[PDB]
């Protein structure tokens, strides 16, 4: 369903199809819709429309009264109401549905997004920090100032948040597996080779996590337990990079094992949202103002760019942790990535 945003001056209105836009791989999801303006107030007053890719990392007026502000990683510009001779050679089916239900004054717009823009992702705040903020987002405005598109202001500017969520490649990549050995203080017997063999690389929202963990044993230091705990990496790039480890979901059974041979259990994790709902510090996919979101997708960084990628660069991992007599809490980690499938 289409939705409009209206300014209290009933001058500009913006009609759009979807707030969530699909970041395809080969392409992006472009914007469609129209801007409906009224001609009586708008006499020789020329409207524009824009797409601001933006990066928020704190307070509005505070971090501004310094030497810098948010780096708008991108800003689109296209000229509405006086179209230099009417140049929308392709219109859109949404615009076809809008132009005829709405009046003769509706002005179409359409926004190509450069894909060197990361996604709309925000940190999960603490419980106690009240005025603290950060996150990447995509917003779009309709506006007009008397001065040409370079200068702009408020009061006619019509806001709207949108999103650009990332989507998965066809290729999953390798068969990632960790299988390795440790060395000790008071049992030189080798006690744990451990093979966290797996089945897939890039999952989606609702496909469980079976870790085929094959322990190899020689004798001593009886192992108590083996938990499998999914490690979300909460990346931040503000002035330094930053992770905040915290397990989204972790499960375990008491399958106990013996000295001088090999065991193997498949341990199955399911990371849910509503179980980590009302919890601190879990990167979630963006939302539309109240509507139900999910856990954040893994963000990936391009293989060499000029400027380091700033934002929440979400990644995950199944940490595989054990408890061993008399209770050493010991594990390992791997790489693996969570994304979307793309309409």
């Amino acid at each position: 369903r289409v939705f409009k945003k209206s300014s209290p001056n009933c001058k500009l209105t913006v009609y759009l199809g979807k707030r969530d836009f699909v970041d395809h791989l080969d392409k992006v999801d472009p914007v469609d819709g129209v801007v409906l303006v009224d001609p009586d107030y708008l006499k020789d007053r020329k409207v524009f429309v824009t797409l601001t890719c933006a990066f928020r990392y704190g307070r509005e007026d505070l971090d501004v009264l310094g030497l810098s502000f948010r780096k708008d990683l991108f800003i689109a510009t296209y000229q509405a109401f006086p179209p230099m001779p009417n140049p929308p050679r392709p219109p859109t089916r949404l615009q076809d549905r809008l132009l005829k239900k709405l009046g003769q004054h509706a002005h179409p717009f359409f926004f190509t997004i450069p894909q060197n823009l990361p996604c709309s992702v925000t940190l999960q705040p603490g419980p106690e920090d009240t005025g603290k903020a950060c996150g990447v987002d995509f917003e779009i405005r309709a506006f007009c100032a008397k001065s040409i598109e370079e200068k702009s202001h408020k009061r006619n500017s019509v806001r709207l948040i949108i999103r650009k969520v990332q989507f998965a490649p066809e290729t999953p990549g390798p068969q990632p597996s960790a299988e390795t050995t440790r060395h000790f203080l008071m049992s030189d017997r080798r006690s744990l080779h451990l093979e966290a063999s797996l089945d897939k690389e890039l999952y989606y929202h609702g496909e469980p996590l079976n870790v085929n963990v094959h322990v190899t044993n020689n004798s001593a230091k009886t192992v108590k337990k083996i938990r499998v705990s999914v490690r979300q990496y909460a990346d931040i790039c503000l002035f330094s990079t930053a992770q905040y480890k915290c397990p989204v979901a972790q499960l375990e059974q008491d399958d106990q094992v013996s000295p001088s041979s090999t065991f193997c259990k498949v341990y199955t994790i399911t990371p849910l949202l509503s179980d980590n709902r009302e919890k601190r510090g879990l990167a979630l996919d963006g939302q539309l103002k109240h509507e139900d979101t999910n856990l954040a997708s893994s963000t990936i960084v391009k293989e060499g760019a000029n400027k380091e990628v700033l934002g929440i660069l979400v990644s995950y991992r199944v940490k595989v942790k054990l408890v061993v007599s008399r209770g050493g809490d010991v594990s390992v980690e791997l790489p693996f990535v969570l994304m979307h499938p793309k309409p």
Partner: peptide, 13 residues
Amino acid sequence: KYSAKTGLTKLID
């Protein structure tokens, strides 16, 4: 120097 502050965005039908 930049943009400004807010007040709405909620309902969608």
